[PDB]
Amino acid sequence: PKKVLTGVVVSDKMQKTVTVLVERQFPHPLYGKVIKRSKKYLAHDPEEKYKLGDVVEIIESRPISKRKRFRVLRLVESGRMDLVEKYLIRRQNYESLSKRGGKA
Amino acid sequence: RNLSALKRHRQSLKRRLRNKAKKSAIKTLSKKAIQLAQEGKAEEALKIMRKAESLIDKAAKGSTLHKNAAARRKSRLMRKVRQLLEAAGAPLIGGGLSA
Amino acid sequence: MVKIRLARFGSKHNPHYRIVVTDARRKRDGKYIEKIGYYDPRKTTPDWLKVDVERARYWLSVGAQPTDTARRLLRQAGVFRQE
RNA sequence: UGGAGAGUUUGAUCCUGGCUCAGGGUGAACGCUGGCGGCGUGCCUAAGACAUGCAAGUCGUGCGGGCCGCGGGGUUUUACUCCGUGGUCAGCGGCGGACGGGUGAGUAACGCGUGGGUGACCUACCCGGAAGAGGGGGACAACCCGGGGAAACUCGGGCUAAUCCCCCAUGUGGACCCGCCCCUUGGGGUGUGUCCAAAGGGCUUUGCCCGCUUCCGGAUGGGCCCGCGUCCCAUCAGCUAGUUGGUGGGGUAAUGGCCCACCAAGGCGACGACGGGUAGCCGGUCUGAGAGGAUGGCCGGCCACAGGGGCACUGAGACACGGGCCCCACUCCUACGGGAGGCAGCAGUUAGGAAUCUUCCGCAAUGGGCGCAAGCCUGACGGAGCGACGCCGCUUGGAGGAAGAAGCCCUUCGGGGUGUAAACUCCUGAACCCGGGACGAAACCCCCGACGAGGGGACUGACGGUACCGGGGUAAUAGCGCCGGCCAACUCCGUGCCAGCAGCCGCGGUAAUACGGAGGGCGCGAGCGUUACCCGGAUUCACUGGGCGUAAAGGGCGUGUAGGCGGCCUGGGGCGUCCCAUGUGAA
Ligand SMILES: [Mg+2]
Ligand SMILES: [Mg+2]
Ligand SMILES: [Mg+2]
Ligand SMILES: [Mg+2]
Ligand SMILES: [Mg+2]
Ligand SMILES: [Mg+2]
Ligand SMILES: [Mg+2]
Ligand SMILES: [Mg+2]
Ligand SMILES: [Mg+2]
Ligand SMILES: [Mg+2]
Ligand SMILES: [Mg+2]
Ligand SMILES: [Mg+2]
Ligand SMILES: [Mg+2]
Ligand SMILES: [Mg+2]
Ligand SMILES: [Mg+2]
Ligand SMILES: [Mg+2]
Ligand SMILES: [Mg+2]
Ligand SMILES: [Mg+2]
Ligand SMILES: [Mg+2]
Ligand SMILES: [Mg+2]
Ligand SMILES: [Mg+2]
Ligand SMILES: [Mg+2]
Ligand SMILES: [Mg+2]
Ligand SMILES: [Mg+2]
Ligand SMILES: [Mg+2]
Ligand SMILES: [Mg+2]
Ligand SMILES: [Mg+2]
Ligand SMILES: [Mg+2]
Ligand SMILES: [Mg+2]
Ligand SMILES: [Mg+2]
Ligand SMILES: [Mg+2]
Ligand SMILES: [Mg+2]
Ligand SMILES: [Mg+2]
Ligand SMILES: [Mg+2]
Ligand SMILES: [Mg+2]
Ligand SMILES: [Mg+2]
Ligand SMILES: [Mg+2]
Ligand SMILES: [Mg+2]
Ligand SMILES: [Mg+2]
Ligand SMILES: [Mg+2]
Ligand SMILES: [Mg+2]
Ligand SMILES: [Mg+2]
Ligand SMILES: [Mg+2]
Ligand SMILES: [Mg+2]
Ligand SMILES: [Mg+2]
Ligand SMILES: [Mg+2]
Ligand SMILES: [Mg+2]
Ligand SMILES: [Mg+2]
Ligand SMILES: [Mg+2]
């Protein structure tokens, strides 16, 4: 079975390609509690069909590039920029964590 | 000292030449055919195309190209030649190509 | 090619062989494809040879080649007895 | 079938808390001691340097020769010349040299583990099935002739065979373009066109054996991709320009920025990017009641590496440890021009070090390469050798033997101890001697059958005159540590805060069970101590399994970002969770 993942498109910024964000719960090996944990896949979108916010199943597939080894299989739930926004703030944060601050 | 892995060496230098030559003959023929089509010289361009198709499959006979490496080379070639007489050819001597 | 041969398994002066299928290129004692018998050349017990002609016949049918004393042992278990 | 605790803070106490011991382990080393055997095991340091020998070849049933012999021919004889046969050498050619063997330097990576994918692929030798080999032509070594170099070696000229090279044919079939059908990533059909085959050898010679060609399948081996797992530092916080994606090329067995040109401006990171440190990964090992911790040494699997750095050739496979080229560092040769090397193969030497083995025997067995076979090769391997380095088995005797020698040791001067211990009586009989003496070995092969199944026969042992069996037969090594508490075991003398001990607590300042010796006692025993390291006791990083008023520990206070967490009722989904089946979980 080619692995199939389900995720949120969080990047349209590429030609014929979408960043897909894929979460996975699971219990922590030593301490028990259920930990969320996520990873971004680059997926092949040849119609530039799928759009920011779409929730797509992504499938294992023969390599298209470095990075691109998945193709967008189908569309689950169309539109939902909460996830995109959720993800978006997470990278907004990054700005703070450095050597200075104030209004930066 | 001395082996006859020594022999194995000099045998290779022989083959290194046989291969090199066979392969030169292709490159130089295939190019010639491609350029005859950029000029739309259809009958002559195929007359070369077919010889190069040969020298390829012939290469693959022994251990020079072998395989689907000749198939690669053949395909790549026959593509460009049909696609370059899209430029008002009509394959005359009509050798290499399916109608 | 894949062989049918002996794999040395006893101890110093205590040879037991496993009769094994394996690519000819493994070490004699390394990873094998399938054990299909065993041989105790000292006949220290009543049960000193054992084959499984079914599997032995299988591997022959796909062209495993047995070493000279493997085939001897295989014959001795009537791998080849066709009557 | 599984969990023990103790000593040490005080005049005493309870608690917190660290330190230490008792237990297990070892590729060990050091000290004292040392009898036999079986089986394991043995450079932890310099992936430092290496003398010498041996370590991958084989095939005359692919081919033609040179050299040294012998024999038979053509002639009336010689000369010249033809044929056969023995040895020998390399050459051409095939297959092997990509396995086997060594090491862990690098590597934190799809390297490894685990589970998947390949409609994106390869696979020599092997097995199965289908079909085929008809003509013709060429060259290069060998050899012959010359040159050059000191040498390693090298240049030119001429001849020639082949299972070496090529051209034409045959087209089962296959490859490629275009089309069409079914499939659905490059899977399977089909039509036209084009392109593509082959090698001969041996005979117990017409018909067998060994080969060759194309295609389809199997089997084995592999490439590549993906999910998930894989150490320490955040006193490393930002990183990236083939970077990220596209189009089209190149390249490959094959996918891919793998590489290139052009275009878009992406990609990555607090779920730890980038950087630094360290490290081969796993099966497993050790420890632990478990959960954990620690580790990767023997063996097995993967990876990587072959003085250091690049590289491609040949080929089914290599970017090749005992192949090729270049650069660097060493050592050697050198006629000063130039050359030759590469033990992390087996032994062995030297250096470093606390420390790590034989320049052994054998191809008898198993296994590998080539060969039709006979066979050849095989420091793989099977054995032997050294070291108490580990494990296990075994011996230094057994039964009797005093109210109880002698010496030594205490003493309350009577005695008490060593002590049934010895002496001694009898008995057995490790060592040693004699004799027999293996298993591992039945195949290849030859005969019968049919080169099948089946039967018959012969050959072969390094270990080794060993194992073991039988006959003789001698009373035949004991050491080391400890005795204040923890911790089993106390007396005398010497010594005087000295000499010394000491794991921790503490001993010794003139009556020391703590030092040194003696007698005795305790514990182990061919061994016993020491050091070093690992887990344990350590719920002393606490998931199981801890804490923070005063013991160490609440942020000076808020705000509220990420994140963590979330009241009662109904329904859907079924991610978490649970269940059954199944595959995997090699040895
Ligand atoms: Mg050869
Ligand atoms: Mg105090
Ligand atoms: Mg006190
Ligand atoms: Mg007390
Ligand atoms: Mg030994
Ligand atoms: Mg070392
Ligand atoms: Mg030898
Ligand atoms: Mg000769
Ligand atoms: Mg020869
Ligand atoms: Mg690193
Ligand atoms: Mg994986
Ligand atoms: Mg076949
Ligand atoms: Mg010449
Ligand atoms: Mg040929
Ligand atoms: Mg032809
Ligand atoms: Mg390392
Ligand atoms: Mg514990
Ligand atoms: Mg070295
Ligand atoms: Mg190198
Ligand atoms: Mg080959
Ligand atoms: Mg090649
Ligand atoms: Mg090599
Ligand atoms: Mg390599
Ligand atoms: Mg070597
Ligand atoms: Mg060595
Ligand atoms: Mg030294
Ligand atoms: Mg040894
Ligand atoms: Mg053999
Ligand atoms: Mg050995
Ligand atoms: Mg026998
Ligand atoms: Mg033999
Ligand atoms: Mg006591
Ligand atoms: Mg005194
Ligand atoms: Mg004392
Ligand atoms: Mg003491
Ligand atoms: Mg013992
Ligand atoms: Mg603990
Ligand atoms: Mg602690
Ligand atoms: Mg807790
Ligand atoms: Mg506490
Ligand atoms: Mg205070
Ligand atoms: Mg406090
Ligand atoms: Mg406060
Ligand atoms: Mg404070
Ligand atoms: Mg919140
Ligand atoms: Mg709730
Ligand atoms: Mg929530
Ligand atoms: Mg579920
Ligand atoms: Mg299961």
Swiss-Prot record, chain A:
Part of the 30S ribosomal subunit. Contacts protein S12. The gene is rpsQ. The keyword Oxidoreductase does not apply. One of its GO terms (molecular function) is rRNA binding. InterPro entries: NA-bd_OB-fold, Ribosomal_uS17, Ribosomal_uS17_bact/chlr, Ribosomal_uS17_CS. GO terms for biological process: translation. Belongs to the universal ribosomal protein uS17 family. PANTHER family: 40S RIBOSOMAL PROTEIN S11 FAMILY MEMBER, SMALL RIBOSOMAL SUBUNIT PROTEIN US17M. This is Small ribosomal subunit protein uS17. SUPFAM superfamilies: Nucleic acid-binding proteins (SSF50249). Disruption phenotype: Increased generation time and a temperature-sensitive phenotype. Coiled coil: none annotated. Keywords: Ribonucleoprotein, Ribosomal protein, RNA-binding, rRNA-binding. One of the primary rRNA binding proteins, it binds directly to 16S rRNA where it helps nucleate assembly of the platform and body of the 30S subunit by bringing together and stabilizing interactions between several different RNA helices. The combined cluster of proteins S8, S12 and S17 appears to hold together the shoulder and platform of the 30S subunit. The keyword Ribosomal protein applies. Pfam families: Ribosomal_S17. GO terms for cellular component: cytosolic small ribosomal subunit. HAMAP family: Ribosomal_uS17_B. It comes from the Bacteria. NCBIfam families: PRK05610.1, uS17_bact.
Curated annotation (Swiss-Prot), chain B:
Residues 1-25 are annotated as: Disordered. Gene3D superfamilies: Ribosomal protein S20. GO terms for molecular function: small ribosomal subunit rRNA binding; structural constituent of ribosome. GO terms for biological process: translation. It comes from the Bacteria. The keyword RNA-binding applies. One of its GO terms (cellular component) is small ribosomal subunit. The keyword Signal does not apply. Keywords: Ribonucleoprotein, Ribosomal protein, RNA-binding, rRNA-binding. SUPFAM superfamilies: Ribosomal protein S20 (SSF46992). InterPro entries: Ribosomal_bS20 (IPR002583), Ribosomal_bS20_sf (IPR036510). HAMAP family: Ribosomal_bS20. PANTHER family: 30S RIBOSOMAL PROTEIN S20 (PTHR33398), SMALL RIBOSOMAL SUBUNIT PROTEIN BS20C (PTHR33398:SF1). Part of the 30S ribosomal subunit. Belongs to the bacterial ribosomal protein bS20 family. One of the primary rRNA binding proteins, it binds directly to 16S rRNA where it nucleates assembly of the bottom of the body of the 30S subunit, by binding to several RNA helices of the 16S rRNA. This is Small ribosomal subunit protein bS20. It comes from Thermus thermophilus (strain ATCC 27634 / DSM 579 / HB8).
UniProtKB/Swiss-Prot annotation, chain C:
Signal peptide: none annotated. The keyword Lyase does not apply. Part of the 30S ribosomal subunit. This is Small ribosomal subunit protein bS16. Belongs to the bacterial ribosomal protein bS16 family. GO terms for molecular function: structural constituent of ribosome. It comes from Thermus thermophilus (strain ATCC 27634 / DSM 579 / HB8). Keywords: Ribonucleoprotein, Ribosomal protein. One of its GO terms (biological process) is translation. The keyword tRNA processing does not apply. SUPFAM superfamilies: Ribosomal protein S16. Pfam families: Ribosomal_S16. InterPro entries: Ribosomal_bS16, Ribosomal_bS16_dom_sf. GO terms for cellular component: cytoplasm; small ribosomal subunit. PANTHER family: 30S RIBOSOMAL PROTEIN S16 (PTHR12919), SMALL RIBOSOMAL SUBUNIT PROTEIN BS16M (PTHR12919:SF20). The gene is rpsP. Binds to the lower part of the body of the 30S subunit, where it stabilizes two of its domains. It comes from the Bacteria.
